[PDB]
Structure 1
Amino acid sequence: DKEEGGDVKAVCLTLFLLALRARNEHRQADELEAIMQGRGSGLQPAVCLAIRVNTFLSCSQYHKMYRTVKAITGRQIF
């Protein structure tokens, strides 16, 4: 209220980001500042196809990996 005027949201988020970066946690803080926007980090089907082909993966193994990721993370990345 003194400096910002009531902007508790931004100052607390930035303080937490700095508290995260102080302990060498760039990964979690980057994930946090990415989810702050509220957009789904998805991949195009062409990208998944290229990954599947250029890494010597059968359709069965790719399906297993897809199922595992979607069931653990609870969201679609591939």
Structure 2
Amino acid sequence: RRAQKHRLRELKIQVKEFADKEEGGDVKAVCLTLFLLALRARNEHRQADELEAIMQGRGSGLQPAVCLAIRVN
């Protein structure tokens, strides 16, 4: 952890200054879409969409009507 901190502090300062100046310090959504598109580049739409969900926040499970629909159909 400390290892990768050292390894990447240069990119850290780079991206933080550039994103803070560009969009007004909203590094959250900037880096969000950054990693989204970067991971989609290698055709990981599965992981990209589940990460879109995890950040969006929604429906980890199902509600009883849907489970009933499944075991009936």
Q: Same fold (TM over 0.5)?
A: yes
Secondary structure of 2:34's aligned partner? helix
Match status 1:40 vs 2:59: yes
Secondary structure of 1:2's aligned partner? helix
Task: Give the whole-Å Cα distance in 1 for the aligned partners of 2:34 and 2:59.
Answer: 25
Q: What percentage of residue pairs aligned between the two structures are identical?
A: 100
More RCO (CA 8 Å, sep 6+):
1
What one-letter code is carried by the residue in structure 2 that aligns with 1:13? L
Aligned residue pairs, count = 54
| CA deviation profile, 1:13-71 (whole Å, cap 9, x unmatched) | 111001111000001000001111222332221221121122xxxxxxxxxxxxxxxxx
Determine which structure has the larger helix proportion and give its number. 2
What one-letter code is carried by the residue in structure 2 that aligns with 1:40? G
What one-letter code is carried by the residue in structure 2 that aligns with 1:2? K
The two structures have a TM-score, normalised by structure 2, of 0.64
CA RMSD of aligned residues (A): 1.3
The two structures have a TM-score, normalised by structure 1, of 0.60
- Please name the residue that 2:24 is paired with: 5
Unaligned runs of 5+ in 1: 55-78
Task: Give the whole-Å Cα distance in 2 for the aligned partners of 1:46 and 1:6.
Answer: 43
Larger mean Cα displacement after TM superposition, 17-26 or 4-13 = 4-13
